[PDB]
Amino acid sequence: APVLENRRARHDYEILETYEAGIALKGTEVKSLRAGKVDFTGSFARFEDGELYLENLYIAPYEKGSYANVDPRRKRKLLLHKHELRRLLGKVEQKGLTLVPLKIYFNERGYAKVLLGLARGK
RNA sequence: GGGGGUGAAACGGUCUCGACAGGGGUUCGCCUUUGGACGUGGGUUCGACUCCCACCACCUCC
């Protein structure tokens, strides 16, 4: 169930700020999440248009049996206010920073939320 | 091939804080409201992830 962070990142990049952003999941995705054999090995977030879609996040699809689910590595959108969103973007694509998946979990109100943060390292 | 069990740490009361769409409003700034994620389509409920309903999938029992 709940809280699973990205241990892959600490030794790779370094966080500047950290935002929290609800994600656009489907439902089975959510079940896969309530479990825990998904990985951020390689996953970061990117703005395809003006919206930010965390990508390469693999979420083992209802992998406690076998089921009739979805594309494990699907570009999942991210939610964040217009103001809270116009920022991070301007502090990034200069290719100096990177949107990397920090932690994942469900909030008080029961919603899976992702935690992102600026990055850089070598 | 039949039988049983499983499909959200609160055993009913949503607001995905946010993006994005669909409204109704607007001094075109913006305010307001609805959706969207809990395997799936179904109804039932003032309202449900949690109550029914099949159909699926896992596991399981002659």
From Swiss-Prot:
Record keywords, A-Z: Cytoplasm, RNA-binding, rRNA-binding
Cellular component annotations (GO), alphabetically ordered: cytosol
GO molecular function, one term: rRNA binding
BP-aspect Gene Ontology terms: trans-translation
Keyword Nucleus among record annotations: no
Primary subcellular site in the record, as a coarse category: cytoplasm
Domain of life assignment: Bacteria
Claim: Cytoplasm is one of the keywords in the record: yes
Subcellular location: Cytoplasm
Functional description taken from the UniProt entry: Required for rescue of stalled ribosomes mediated by trans-translation. Binds to tmRNA (also known as SsrA and 10Sa), required for stable association of tmRNA with ribosomes, probably by bridging tmRNA to 50S subunit. tmRNA and SmpB together mimic tRNA shape, replacing the anticodon stem-loop with SmpB. tmRNA is encoded by the ssrA gene; the 2 termini fold to resemble tRNA(Ala) and it encodes a 'tag peptide', a short internal open reading frame. During trans-translation Ala-aminoacylated tmRNA acts like a tRNA, entering the A-site of stalled ribosomes, displacing the stalled mRNA.
Miscellaneous comment text of the record: Athough the Valle et al., electron microscopy paper indicates this protein came from T.thermophilus, its sequence maps to A.aeolicus. The Fu et al., paper maps the coordinates of T.thermophilus to E.coli.
Subunit comment: Binds tmRNA. Binds to both the 50S and 30S ribosomal subunits via rRNA contacts, bridges tmRNA binding to stalled ribosomes.
Family that this chain belongs to: Belongs to the SmpB family.
Protein name per Swiss-Prot or TrEMBL: SsrA-binding protein
Organism (species): Thermus thermophilus (strain ATCC 27634 / DSM 579 / HB8)
Highest classification ranks of the organism: Bacteria, Thermotogati, Deinococcota, Deinococci, Thermales
Shown part of the complete sequence: 2 to 123 of 144
